[PDB]
Paper text:
The DEAD-box protein Prp28 is essential for pre-mRNA splicing as it plays a key role in the formation of an active spliceosome. Prp28 participates in the release of the U1 snRNP from the 5′-splice site during association of the U5·U4/U6 tri-snRNP, which is a crucial step in the transition from a pre-catalytic spliceosome to an activated spliceosome. Human Prp28 (hPrp28; also denoted U5-100K) comprises 820 amino-acid residues. The helicase core with the conserved sequence motifs corresponds to the C-terminal half of the protein.
Here, we report the crystal structure of hPrp28ΔN, a fragment of human Prp28 comprising the entire helicase core and a short N-terminal extension (NTE). The structure was refined at a resolution of 2.0 Å and contains residues 352–806. The three-dimensional structure of hPrp28ΔN can be divided into four parts: an N-terminal extension (NTE; residues 352–378), the N-terminal RecA-like domain (RecA-1; residues 379–629), the linker region (residues 630–639) and the C-terminal RecA-like domain (RecA-2; residues 640–806). In the crystal the helicase domain adopts a wide-open conformation, as the two RecA-like domains are extraordinarily displaced from the productive ATPase conformation. Interestingly, the defined arrangement of the hPrp28ΔN RecA domains appears to be a favourable one as there are many intramolecular contacts between the two RecA domains, e.g. a salt bridge between Lys382 and Glu640 and five hydrogen bonds (Ile379–Gly759, Thr381–Gly759, Thr381–Ser761, Lys382–Val788 and Glu614–Ser790). Interestingly, the linker of Prp28 appears to be arrested in its conformation by a tight network of hydrogen bonds, which consequently keeps the RecA domains in a wide-open state. A unique feature of hPrp28 is the insertion of 24 amino acids (residues 576–599), which form a protuberance on the RecA-1 domain. Binding of ATP is hindered by a closed conformation of the P-loop, which occupies the space required for the γ-phosphate of ATP. Moreover, the conformation of the P-loop is affected by the bound sulfate ion located between the proposed binding sites of the α- and β-phosphates of the ATP.
Numbering used by the authors: 352 to 694, 703 to 723, 728 to 806
């Protein structure tokens, strides 16, 4: 009976639905477990008074979408992959948790007599982008007494060499310049607890993968988070963030795309990162995780069962192409001891209620966001496919769409391939991407 929009409510009134609408309003898609709620406004945020004062004085009146969601994850010391393009407020999204961390260290702990390099390094692919980041970092950092030094090309080595001697809290750099400096020990990463790769896809495109690898090799290994479920446990990671000086490092990667090289970087640099993806409200394929299995038709039922046996978050939807399929597949599942609905309102209530866990259906209303869509039969055109996978929701948890492809589906391979190659939240599937039938438009 309370039908207010969330923006009419106080923070402590926010419901699950309100958070869903909220993420829809800002086009916030995520991946990872136990994502903290996004920031509704600066005032509504739990940022320290002095931090908010600097935010307010710099003029940033409202958090941008990436800032809304990434900032709270960063404040739990969690790694992040942020999918968003320059101009979207990425820089402040990563700068803010760092500034909270630095300026809240005990003075006794902020004390070091010898110069031990930066608390943070921000790596950019180009001199032009690095300077943008620098200007913004200075404007945030100076009021807070935080020093920033740029290690980039296009600047004198005297000036650069000098500035280095003075000590700093943040270094902004380009890969080529940074490796040379490390290789000559003009700078060390002894107290670095914050690693940022900005435009990692562009770094890859420029040929910087090996240099970015070699740079990682200079970070002290013993401050990396453990590779376990604990790396994305909020209670534990929050307690680690607050642990001040001795926390695990955190790493942030920003990129517009996820080709395999970028995924390699991520596997090395990051531990159980959360994904924050902004945009594509109208284009589900860009923002829904898609997986495909090529098989013969006779293999479909056993692959489905194997998938189901792995367990799922009900409800899920399985799509088939013909209504007879719908009915017979549904029977078999109820035989395997599954609660299956076929496809009026009555069906969705049970699903919504938890009664039924699996909806079987053809391309033919209105239904909740689902964790998983399975295309047991692939759609006959890419527009129907798009509409199907769109059922994981407009925003919020990416969800997963799993598609069974056979040779009878060859006429949608090229467009299916495009749908996935344009999906930064999806892994490139060489089985389809390299397939002889996915190379040219059909007809
Ligand atoms: Hg670093």
């Amino acid at each position: 009976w309370d039908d207010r929009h969330w923006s009419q409510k106080k923070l402590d009134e926010m419901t699950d639905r309100d958070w869903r609408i909220f993420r829809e309003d800002y086009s916030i898609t995520t991946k990872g477990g136990k994502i903290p709620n996004p920031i509704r406004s600066w005032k509504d945020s739990s940022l320290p008074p002095h931090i908010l004062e600097v935010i307010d004085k710099c003029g940033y009146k409202e958090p941008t979408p990436i800032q809304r969601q990434a900032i709270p994850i960063g404040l739990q010391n969690r790694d992040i992959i942020g999918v968003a393009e320059t101009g979207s407020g990425k820089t402040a999204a990563f700068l803010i948790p760092l500034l909270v961390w630095i300026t809240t260290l005990p003075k006794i702990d902020r004390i070091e007599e010898s110069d031990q390099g930066p608390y943070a390094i921000i790596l950019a692919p180009t001199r032009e982008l690095a300077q943008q980041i620098e200007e913004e970092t200075i404007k945030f950092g100076k009021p807070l007494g935080i020093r920033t030094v740029a290690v980039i090309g296009g600047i004198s080595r005297e000036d650069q060499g000098f500035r280095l001697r003075m000590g700093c809290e943040i270094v902004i750099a380009t890969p080529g310049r940074l490796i040379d400096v490390l290789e000559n020990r003009y700078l060390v990463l002894s107290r670095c607890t914050y690693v940022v790769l900005d435009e990692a896809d562009r770094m890859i495109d420029m040929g910087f993968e090996p240099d970015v690898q070699k740079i990682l090799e200079h970070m002290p290994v013993s401050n990396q988070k453990p590779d376990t479920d604990e790396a994305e446990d909020p209670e534990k990671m929050l307690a680690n963030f607050e642990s001040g000086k001795h926390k695990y490092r955190q790493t942030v990667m920003f990129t517009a795309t996820m080709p395999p090289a970028v995924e390699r970087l991520a596997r090395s640099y990051l531990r159980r990162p959360a994904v924050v993806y902004i945009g594509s409200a109208g284009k589900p394929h860009e923002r829904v995780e898609q997986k495909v299995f090529l098989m013969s038709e006779s293999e479909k039922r056993k692959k489905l069962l194997a998938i189901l046996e792995q367990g799922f978050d009900p409800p899920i939807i399985i799509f088939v192409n013909q209504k007879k399929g719908c009915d017979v597949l549904a029977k078999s599942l109820e035989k395997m001891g599954y609660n299956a609905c076929t496809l009026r309102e009555f069906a969705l209530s049970n699903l919504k209620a938890g009664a039924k866990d699996i909806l079987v259906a053809t391309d033919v209303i209105d239904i909740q966001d689902v964790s998983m869509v399975v295309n047991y039969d692939m759609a006959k055109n890419i527009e129907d496919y798009i509409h199907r996978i769109g059922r994981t929701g407009r925003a919020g948890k990416s969800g997963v769409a799993i598609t069974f492809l056979t040779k009878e589906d060859s006429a949608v391979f090229y467009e299916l391939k495009q749908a996935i190659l344009e999906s930064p939240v999806s892994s490139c599937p060489p089985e389809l991407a390299n397939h002889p039938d996915a190379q040219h438009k059909p007809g």
